[PDB]
Ligand binder design. Structure first.
Ligand SMILES: NC(=O)c1ncn([C@@H]2O[C@H](CO)[C@@H](O)[C@H]2O)n1
Ligand SMILES: NC(=O)c1ncn([C@@H]2O[C@H](CO)[C@@H](O)[C@H]2O)n1
Ligand SMILES: [Mg+2]
Ligand SMILES: [Mg+2]
Lengths: 480, 480
C-alpha cells in the first residue's frame, strides 16, 4: 500500500485483494413446482454455474458495474447557490434536531447488524464473535483497535468489499444483457468508527423523519399517511427517477453533506477524522485487487444512506434554486421533499421550468429519467396519486393517503420465498412450513386492492386457517 | 312524579328539587396583589355575595340560561337528505371503527371522573365512596342498582342537576349584562349505564380521531399537526362559529346520532334502552324544582360530547348536501371536517354558496355567526391560517401546522391560578408554591410566538430556576 500501479476495470490497483469469491447462490426458492408465468421475475444471474444461461463470469459482470466510477464527473452547482442551500439545510437541522449525548463504544457495537459480514479482513458473520454485549476473538480485536483510533482522533483507511446483490429481477437482466447490482461492504473497524461518530446525529434525524425530508427510519404503514398528507399540501408533484444515482455522485458534494453531519455531531472533532476517512479516495476489494475509487458514493457503513439522502437534498435544492431563483429556505417554505438515498418525491407550489430543471440536474452529472423513458425533460403532475416512494404506490381515498404495494410485487412474493443460500432458484423448499407474519402482511397489501383481488390472493396455505374477512384486514391495515 | 303541573322559567315543573344551592365561590385566585390591567377578564359572577357588583341572584341568572330551551325548534333537514347523510356517516364509521368487546360494570366504574359530583341524589364527590376499584356505601348502592337495570334492559329516568360554570370571562359579563354558563350534571346511575352502553363505541371512536372528524380525545400537541395537515389538503376553509349550539339542538337530530351509536355498540339492545332514556324529555333539577326539558342537548354524562359531535357532523353534512347537491359520501371525499361538540373546522374543495349555506343552517334553527358579528352570511377563506379549534389558533410554517394559544390567553393564565373554592377572586393564594408543569407548558406556548414575546413571559418565578433557552423550548414544544 505505498502508491498505486496497474489498472483493473479502468481504475487504479492499490493492492492485492483479500475478498472471498463472489457468491454463486441465491436465497430465493420457488414456493411451488409449477411452471412460472411467462415474463416472470427471477433471482439475478449466479455466474458460470447458473444452469439457466451461459453467460460471463461474476467478475466480468462486476467489471461492468464499475465503469461509471471512471466516467468524468458532472459540474459543481454554482458556488453561491451551493453555499446558500447547505446553510439553509444545516440551519433547518439545527432548528429541528434534538441535541444528543455521545455514543459509547458499547452503543456503537450493539447498533451493528449482527447477521451481515464483518468485511475486511475476517469476512465472518458478525454474530460469530458476538457475546450478546461485546465482540470477542478476532472481531473483538478489530473492534477495540478501531475504537482506540477513534478516541485518539487518529485516521484509518477504510477497506470495502465488493459484492453483487441477490434479488429478483426482470427476466431480461438474466436472458438478455446480464446485469447484477454492485454492493459496497464496509469493514468492521470503519462501521465502529462511523457508528460512534454519527449514530447520535442519525438517531436525532430519524426522530425527525416526518417533518424533515430525510425519511430513513419511517414506517410506511404508520408514517406514510402523515408524510403523504404533507406532500399533498402542495400543488405540483414529481419524481426525477434517477439512473445510477450512487455512482454519479461527486465526492465534493458528499463532503458538503459530510460537513453538515460533522458539525451537528456531539463529538465534532472526532467525527471529522472519521468523515475525512469515509470520503477520501476509497479502497474497494474486488477479489484479485483492491482498487482506488475516487468518485461516486462509497456506500458501505451504517450511516451512508443518510449521507446520500443529505447529498440528494443538497442537489435537489440546488437545481430548484438555480431555476426558480428563489432562496433555498423560501423554497423549503413552498415545498415538501422526501428523500431516501436516491429515492425521491418532490412537491412544491413553485412554478418550476421543467426543461431548465432537467438540464440543471444533468449538468451536475445526474441521470434523471422520464416515466416513459423517452428523451427528456421530466414531467410534473398536479396530483400526488401515481407517484411512488420506497417501492409503494402512493394512494389517496376519503380516509387519507397511504402506500400500496402493486399487485405484481404481491404476486411475486407469493411465487418466491427466502431460505438458505442455494444454487438452483427453481428448487422448492422442502420445509413446507414458512411465512408467518409474512403471509398476513401480504393479505394486508392485497386487501388495499379491493375484495376481488384480495379473494384471489387468499390462496392461501400452507402447506393453519382461516382467511380473515376482507373488511377486517382492510381495516386493520389502514387504521390503528 | 305523576304528571307535570306548574311553570318555572317557562318550562313545566315535574317535581320538587333536591339540588344543593348554586356555588357562590370561584376556584381562581390572583397570582399577584398588583392591580389588574383595565379590561382584564375575571371569574364569572358569584351572586348576591359578590363584592364586585350588585346584581341578580344566581337563580335569576340561571333562569335566563333556560330561556332558549322553550324557543320553538328549527326545521328538520329534508328527510331524504337526512337519511342519506346518516347512512353515509354510519357507513364511514363501520369501515373505520375497530369492533369492541362489551364493557364490564367494573370498567364503566373506573372510567368515571372521581373528582366531580355524583349528582342526584347524594351530590357527593365520587371519590368519597370509591375504594380504588369499586363504589361502596351510598354510591355503591346507586351504582349497583343502575347496573342491574342496565343488564335487564330496564329503563331509568335520568335526573340532571343544573349548575353554572366557574370560568374567566370578559369584564362585560360581570359589570354589564350578567351572564354565566349553564351546566348539566348527570346522576351517577345514568353515568354508569351510559358508560357501559357507550364506552366501547367512544373508545373505538377516539382511536380514530385523526382520520374521522370527531376529534374528542386528540392531543393538540401530538395530533394537531397531522389533523391540520389533512385540512390543508383542501381549498376552502371556514368556521360557522355558532351561538347557543347545545340549547338549539333538536332531539330528533340527537336521536339519529343516537341510533348510530346504538347500532355501532357491542350490546345494541341494552344500549337502546339507555339511549332512549338519555333522549326522552329530561328532568333538570334547578334547586327548588325539577323541570322538564324536551328539547336542546342534555349534556350530562360521559359520552354526550361524542353524541353532540355526531349531531354536528349530521347537520353540517345536511347543509352542505342541500346546497351543493352532491352526495354525502362524495362530500366526504372532497372535504375534511373537525368537530368537538359545537367546535368546528370545515375544509372542502367544493364550491359552496355561502348565502345558501348560512340560510340552511339558520333554517335547522342553528345560530352561526360571522367573525365580525355583522348580519350574515358566513365567509369562507382559502387559507387555514387564522381559523381556530379547541381555543388554539391554527398556525402553519415550513415545519408544518400546529395549534397556538394566543398571547391574551397566555397573559391571562399568568394572572390567575386554580386553587380551592373561595369568595373573593382578588385574594392571592398564600401558598406561593404552585404551577409545576403548568409554567413549563406556558413557556412552550409563548416560545411559539417568537423570542421577543417569549423573553417577557419568562417572568418568571416563583415565588427554582432557570429559564430554558428559547430555541430549546421551541424545539421541544413543536417537535418530538
Ligand atoms: N432506492 C432506495 O430506496 C435506496 N435505498 C438506499 N439507497 C441509497 O443508496 C445506497 C446504496 O444503495 C444506500 O446506502 C442509500 O444511500 N437508495
Ligand atoms: N366549544 C367546545 O370545544 C366544546 N366542548 C364540549 N362541547 C360540547 O358541548 C357540550 C356541553 O358544553 C359538551 O358535552 C360537548 O358536546 N363543545
Ligand atoms: Mg420516487
Ligand atoms: Mg372553530
Amino acid at each position: 500500500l505505498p502508491r498505486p500501479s496497474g489498472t483493473y476495470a479502468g481504475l487504479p490497483i492499490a493492492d492485492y485483494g483479500d475478498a472471498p469469491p463472489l457468491s454463486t447462490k441465491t436465497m430465493f426458492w420457488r414456493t411451488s413446482p409449477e411452471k412460472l408465468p411467462p415474463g416472470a421475475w427471477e433471482p439475478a444471474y449466479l455466474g458460470s454455474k447458473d444452469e439457466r444461461v451461459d453467460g460471463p463470469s461474476l467478475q466480468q459482470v462486476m467489471r461492468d458495474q464499475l465503469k461509471p466510477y471512471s466516467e468524468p464527473r458532472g459540474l459543481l452547482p454554482p458556488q453561491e447557490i451551493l453555499d446558500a442551500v447547505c446553510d439553509a439545510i444545516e440551519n433547518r437541522l439545527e432548528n429541528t434536531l434534538e441535541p444528543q449525548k455521545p455514543w459509547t463504544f458499547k452503543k456503537a457495537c450493539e447498533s451493528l447488524d449482527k447477521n451481515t459480514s464483518s468485511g475486511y479482513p475476517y469476512h465472518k458473520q458478525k454474530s460469530k464473535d458476538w457475546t450478546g454485549s461485546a465482540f470477542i476473538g478476532d472481531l473483538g480485536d478489530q473492534a477495540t483497535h478501531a475504537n482506540n483510533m477513534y478516541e485518539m482522533g487518529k485516521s484509518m483507511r477504510p477497506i470495502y468489499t465488493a459484492a453483487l446483490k441477490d434479488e429478483l429481477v426482470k427476466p431480461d437482466k438474466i436472458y438478455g444483457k446480464i446485469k447484477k447490482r454492485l454492493l459496497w461492504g464496509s469493514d468492521l473497524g470503519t462501521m465502529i468508527r462511523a457508528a460512534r461518530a454519527f449514530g447520535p446525529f442519525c438517531d436525532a434525524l430519524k426522530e425527525t423523519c416526518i417533518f424533515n425530508p430525510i425519511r430513513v427510519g419511517m414506517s410506511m404503514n404508520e408514517d406514510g399517511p402523515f408524510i403523504f398528507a404533507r406532500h399533498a399540501n402542495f400543488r405540483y408533484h414529481m419524481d426525477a427517477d434517477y439512473t445510477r444515482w450512487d455512482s454519479t455522485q461527486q465526492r465534493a458534494i458528499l463532503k458538503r453533506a459530510g460537513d453538515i453531519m460533522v458539525r451537528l455531531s456531539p463529538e465534532p472533532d472526532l467525527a471529522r477524522v472519521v468523515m475525512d476517512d469515509l470520503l477520501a479516495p476509497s479502497l474497494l476489494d474486488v477479489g484479485d485487487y483492491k482498487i482506488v475509487v475516487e468518485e461516486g458514493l462509497p456506500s458501505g457503513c451504517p450511516c451512508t444512506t443518510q449521507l446520500n439522502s443529505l447529498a440528494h437534498w443538497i442537489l435537489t435544492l440546488c437545481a430548484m434554486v438555480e431555476v426558480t431563483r428563489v432562496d433555498p429556505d423560501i423554497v423549503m417554505q413552498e415545498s415538501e421533499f422526501s428523500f431516501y438515498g436516491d429515492d425521491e418525491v418532490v412537491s412544491t407550489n413553485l412554478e418550476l421550468d421543467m426543461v431548465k430543471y432537467t438540464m440543471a440536474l444533468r449538468r451536475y452529472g445526474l441521470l434523471p429519467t422520464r416515466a416513459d423513458k423517452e428523451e427528456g425533460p421530466l414531467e410534473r403532475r398536479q396530483t400526488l396519486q401515481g407517484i411512488s416512494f420506497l417501492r409503494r404506490a402512493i394512494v389517496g381515498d376519503q380516509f387519507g393517503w397511504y402506500g400500496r404495494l402493486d399487485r405484481a410485487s404481491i404476486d411475486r412474493q407469493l411465487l418466491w420465498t427466502k431460505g438458505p443460500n442455494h444454487q438452483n432458484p427453481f428448487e422448492t423448499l422442502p420445509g413446507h412450513a414458512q411465512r408467518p407474519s409474512q403471509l398476513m402482511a401480504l393479505l394486508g397489501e392485497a386487501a388495499m386492492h379491493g375484495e376481488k383481488y384480495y379473494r384471489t390472493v387468499a390462496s392461501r396455505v400452507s402447506k393453519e386457517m382461516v382467511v380473515p374477512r376482507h373488511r377486517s384486514v382492510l381495516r386493520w391495515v389502514r387504521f390503528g
